[PDB]
């Protein structure tokens, strides 16, 4: 490994994603294959490319060293194996969705999805999301309200 001069970058970089981010998910990759990463990188791909991460770090000692910053709801995620996912642009989006759909294709556990932060809380798969731009679901709420 590297000394501190390097354990600091994995911090100053990874924590300015939290400081400058959008949504957070969860997942434990016990059996995390590489067809695994391959896929989810195309997903990050659709979800821009390299706007997304997953930098395995669940050393509390790392991606909690980014938490007493923001998201101290994660002192509780960080135990055991974890795969932290941050969003920069994009809706508070679909990121959420396929992690459940992925891991529900066996694709290993999902930490039961211990969940995360947009609010400041816990678990439950939501597509309360990428409807986003479904302001059309407030366009159809126009003419249909005007007519009916």
């Amino acid at each position: 490994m590297a000394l501190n001069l390097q354990d600091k970058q994995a911090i100053v970089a990874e924590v300015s994603e939290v400081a400058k981010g959008a949504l957070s998910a969860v997942v434990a990759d016990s059996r995390g294959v590489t067809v695994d990463k391959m896929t989810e990188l195309r997903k990050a791909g659709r979800e821009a490319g390299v706007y997304m991460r997953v930098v395995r770090n669940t050393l509390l000692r790392r991606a909690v060293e980014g938490t007493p910053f923001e998201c101290l709801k994660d002192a509780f995620v960080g135990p055991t194996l974890i795969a932290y996912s941050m969003e920069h642009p994009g809706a508070a989006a679909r990121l959420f969705k396929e992690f459940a759909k992925a891991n529900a294709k066996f694709e290993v556990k999902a930490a039961a999805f211990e969940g995360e932060l947009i609010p400041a809380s816990q678990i439950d798969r939501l597509a309360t999301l990428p409807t986003y731009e479904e302001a059309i679901a407030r366009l159809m709420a126009t003419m249909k309200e005007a007519s009916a």
Binding site: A135, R138, T142, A146
Partner: peptide, 30 residues
Amino acid sequence: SITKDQIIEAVAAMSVMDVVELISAMEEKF
């Protein structure tokens, strides 16, 4: 209110205008 006076603007408008707006149209009614 005037329905045409709220269609001519309600088909043509910006973006982030809406993004910090229709996370809340859901609130007054629904």
